[PDB]
């Protein structure tokens, strides 16, 4: 319990940020391979 406790220094807010940011990156990757597979159909859809 303690040996696990010491190792995280931040507090709820920072961790919350780590998540939010990664979720943004999943959004990016997804939207990309959206556009990639649409290029494999040749139809070119512009990014927002």
């Amino acid at each position: 319990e303690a040996r696990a406790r010491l190792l995280n220094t931040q507090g709820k807010k920072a961790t919350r940020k780590i998540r939010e940011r990664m979720l943004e990156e999943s959004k990016r990757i997804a939207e990309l391979q959206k556009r990639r597979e649409l290029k494999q159909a040749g139809i070119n859809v512009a990014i927002k």
Partner: protein
């Protein structure tokens, strides 16, 4: 509508599974019931042997030049596309009927008559469905694994226990991920979707075009095309068997990265335009 562009014979046994090069669209990898894999040009390029028994599933990697094939021999075999030789052999699966390659993590997801889903470090075992596991998929955000089993359920997994259970199916033999963040799940007579589709008995694979067209292969040989938004069925076709009326069915199917590729139980691949 759709129609029949091309017929490709050349497998000795049935065609169980088909996957397509995710980058250049230049070829197929097609399993077989003869244990081989024959890489077709979207002519026959090469033959990849090395399984002793039939190949239920094949999946090609995006970020990697790797090809993960999996069979009834209880083994998940890697393939290095560069030099075309088996690199790695997995394990834990005394037949494995599904492989799906997690997009961003360098993971494998395998499943089969084990009734468990194994996350392979290219680590986790997911206790789960009460029967064999037919079809498995991977997603970048939450639930990262969707699974479908012959207990007639579909589970949405949290890999880091079940996040959600979907019981509305009355065996779920096929799923496909819409390239909208949803899934299309199948059963005997009713093809549903999950974040309905009108079907009379079609009993008993699915594929989703980027145009929101939802393909459904029959075991009666009928090709049931749908719109994905509505649920409407705008077309139903019937394949010509070959030069038995029982052998007419559709084992697998896929779309490229405007064409359709369906391996059939008649020992032929057909290309629908």
């Amino acid at each position: 509508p759709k129609k029949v562009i091309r017929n490709y014979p050349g497998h000795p046994e049935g065609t169980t599974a088909l996957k397509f090069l995710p980058k250049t669209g230049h070829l197929i990898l097609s399993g077989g019931n003869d244990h081989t894999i024959k890489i077709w040009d979207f002519e026959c390029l090469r033959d990849f042997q090395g399984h002793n028994k039939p190949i239920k599933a094949l999946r090609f990697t995006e970020d990697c030049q790797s090809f993960l094939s999996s069979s009834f021999d209880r083994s998940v075999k890697i393939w290095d596309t560069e030099t075309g030789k088996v690199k790695t052999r997995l394990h834990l699966n005394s037949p494995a009927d599904v492989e799906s390659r997690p997009t961003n993590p360098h993971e494998f997801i395998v499943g089969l008559s084990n009734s468990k889903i194994l996350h392979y470090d290219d680590v986790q075992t997911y206790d789960h469905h009460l029967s064999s596991i037919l079809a498995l998929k991977y997603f970048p955000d939450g639930s990262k694994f969707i699974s479908s089993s012959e207990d007639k359920t579909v589970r949405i997994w949290e890999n880091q226990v079940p996040i959600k259970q979907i019981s509305d199916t009355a065996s779920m033999p096929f799923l496909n991920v819409h390239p909208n963040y949803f899934c299309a799940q199948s059963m005997d007579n009713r093809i549903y979707s999950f974040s309905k589709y009108k079907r009379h008995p079609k009993k008993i694979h699915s594929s989703a075009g980027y145009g929101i067209s939802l393909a459904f292969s029959g075991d009666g040989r009928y090709i049931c095309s749908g719109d994905s938004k509505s649920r409407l069925f705008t077309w139903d076709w019937n394949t010509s068997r070959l030069l038995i009326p029982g052998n007419k069915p559709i084992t697998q199917v896929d779309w490229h990265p405007s064409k359709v590729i369906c391996s059939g139980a008649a020992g032929k691949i057909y290309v629908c335009d």
